[PDB]
Amino acid sequence: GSMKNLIAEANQAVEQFAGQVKARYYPAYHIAAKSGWINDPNGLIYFNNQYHVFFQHHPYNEQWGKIHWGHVVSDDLVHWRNLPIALAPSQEYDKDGCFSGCAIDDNGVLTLIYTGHVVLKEAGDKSVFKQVQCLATSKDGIHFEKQGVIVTPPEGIMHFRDPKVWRQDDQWYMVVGVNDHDNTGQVWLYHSQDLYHWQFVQVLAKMADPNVYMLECPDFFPLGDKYVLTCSPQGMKANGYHYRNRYQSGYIVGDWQPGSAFTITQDFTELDFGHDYYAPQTLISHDQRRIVIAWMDMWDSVMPSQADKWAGVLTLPRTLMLSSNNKLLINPITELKSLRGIQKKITSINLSNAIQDLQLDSMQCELILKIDLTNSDAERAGIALSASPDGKQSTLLYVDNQAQRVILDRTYSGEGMVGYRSVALPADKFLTLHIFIDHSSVEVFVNEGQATLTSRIYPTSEKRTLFLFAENGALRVEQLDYWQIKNMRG
Amino acid sequence: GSMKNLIAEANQAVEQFAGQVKARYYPAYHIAAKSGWINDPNGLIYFNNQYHVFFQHHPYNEQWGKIHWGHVVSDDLVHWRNLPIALAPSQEYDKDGCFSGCAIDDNGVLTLIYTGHVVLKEAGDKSVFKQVQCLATSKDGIHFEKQGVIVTPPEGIMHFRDPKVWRQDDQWYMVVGVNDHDNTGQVWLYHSQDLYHWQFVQVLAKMADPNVYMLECPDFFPLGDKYVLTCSPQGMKANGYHYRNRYQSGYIVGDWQPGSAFTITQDFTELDFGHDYYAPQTLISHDQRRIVIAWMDMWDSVMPSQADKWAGVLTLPRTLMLSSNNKLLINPITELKSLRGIQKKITSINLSNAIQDLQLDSMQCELILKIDLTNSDAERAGIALSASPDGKQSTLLYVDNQAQRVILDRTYSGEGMVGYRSVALPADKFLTLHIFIDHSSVEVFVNEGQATLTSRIYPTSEKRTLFLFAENGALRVEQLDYWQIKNMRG
Hints:
The structure is a homodimer. Helix content of chain A is about 5%, strand content about 50%. Chain A has 1 helix and 31 strands. The relative contact order of chain A is 0.13. Chains A and B meet through loops of A and loops of B. Chains A, B: Pathway: Glycan biosynthesis; sucrose metabolism.
């Protein structure tokens, strides 16, 4: 009945099914539970010389259900260690889930502020529920004590969730996402002197598209001379190359100071153009980088790992910097280089109407592929990742010279979902693809961080290699760097 | 030595290898030689109650070589009958080929005006040759008599070819394509009172792109209140979705009258957005339609039919009409309906994340597929043409809702070339695809004739079916009409 006993029960279920988890799709250097289901990352913080990541977690099976907070820690944002579960549903205010939230340092006390979820009437997607903001503390970083409800919404407001709290002007601010009376998604800003008593300040942001019914997972933070709002809109219609995923994740750049509206200088932009990127949260690193982690997955997608008694992976952590035109340059954190093994460097690889097996293991590896766009005039030219030795199965990452786009096509990748995602080719003589392959994922960083593509893949081949290919013309690879990537856990 | 004996020898070679031609790729209702190689259509004319089409023809094997004029006839632009060869190289002025040309009615005498080609020095692509315009006559429509050279170029002009001649103001005009002293492609206009003595009138057209070194196969004709120039530029760089084929075919719309420049109102536009469309020529039908036929092929493409001792197919004949914004609406001639057999009508077919075998023979058939674009929101949704029963092999014709384009992808079609061609989705609630499938070809007419896609395919399956497919969303087919198409020859 006590949360201490509910956490012990939950930890025992995770430990029980951990032995049934197959390696084929389990990430070597991304965050996953030992077994069972995870989704959105929560409570990101650098606290007492360590990086903490929590996540939405169903401990009892590989599907979504009674949500707990899972927990990992690292010294270096890379060597993530599994910890015991932090929060289990245990009170009227959180009976049906400890939903998303953040962490803060309250005068040396690690403090979690999360949405408590309770179902009031079960009608599937027509369900009525109660969402309020709740607070928990820890003296040791491992065991947490609930301190109860701290923010209740207005009457008629139901969707009211995903608090992100920060200190400013010896005061605290909170952003939450809300579905308003007129059925529009908004981010609301609240403030507090004590973390227990909160007052509404303003509607921080809404979107012009009236079909956006929710803004999940708001994070509002300074970056250079601007403020950035990252969030996850629901209800944006897929439009050409835009908003292809079931739900969106992206960013708004503007100007704000306490007492002012958030005046938008750059409208909503997707954070990642791939298939599997949802529910970003950020933290400030020790050296004051702005770091984003997201769920490397998408609601309603086929999840082949569920056959193996686990599901859910987080993205690599990525740095956020403003370009001079106030777009986010997004790059892998430098600490990932610590996982690098055997380096292989190939220079000046030409192909014309041909394929080439590079004979490089594609289970867990990092590539830097520099392509000469002027002289790579093939209709389709690039790399086949995580490929069967017969080349029948692969994840295609290539220049389409007709579309003038980079294509990530998982149609022939293995189990689960088909089709492609894409970005516009950058205005540059050279295209650099910085590619991280794990057992069930591809992350691509384009050029200096101008764009990223993140997709899950589920290869079925016993051995995984890489091919280069050029169809109907030439590929010019100026340089290919390859590293094997070590398991982060040892 | 005599052309009469050279034609007999050439006809005997065609007859000799005709028995070795396999059905698998041989067109049931498009023009081909009985055996051997054909390319550009020549001498299109309605003469003495019959439609004549000639074509560049190598009778002795399935590769390009000593060029003859092949010849077919029809009463109805559809039931084409093979005739004996019309012209064989036989003189100093045409020793290495009777290259392209036209036909006119010279006061009841069917008259051919063609380029005579002779190699002066063999250096591959560095070869020096002589091209002059020559004339031949016929009293019977079958046997032709050479009357010698009628137009010689200026000194230093080598590429000088593909005459198209028409009567206007009791005078004759000729257009030829030329490579000028500065290495630019031009169309030159000449005139004559007698068909034997020609005078240069003007440079009719040149293109702004200085890399265009040749304009092959010019045809200059009135359409409504405009003049249209169809031609085949060489040297246009492939640019995004534009100019993908090795060489181009397209049209220029403007204003002209004798004594004036051809003032361009619509710049060069491709005639067909597919893989296999080159060297159009036009004729006036009995009822005064403007009809275009082209070579349904492309220089330098893999030609799998060459294993079967023949190569080369002409397109369907198509009508040309000016839209109110002076683009060509291009439609199949109505006489093709005479080939229709068993009709099958399906209404209101929905698919979501699924495939459906329509169990319809795709050897030789006509389809009208009407798609609801508003409700066909799948990432990829359409038809798999000429498909193996296991669906491993097919020609994909579909809506890409990310690109917002119609895609014709022959990557999995069978033997030979891979990759796709495309057109922009029309601004219309509905997309109509009017599709003609023959043993080695697909022709698509979009909506009212706004765009066409023509590609060769080489299926290897013993049985050929059709599938509908929708990936990552819905397909709404409002109506599918199917006809089996009869062999035109009986």
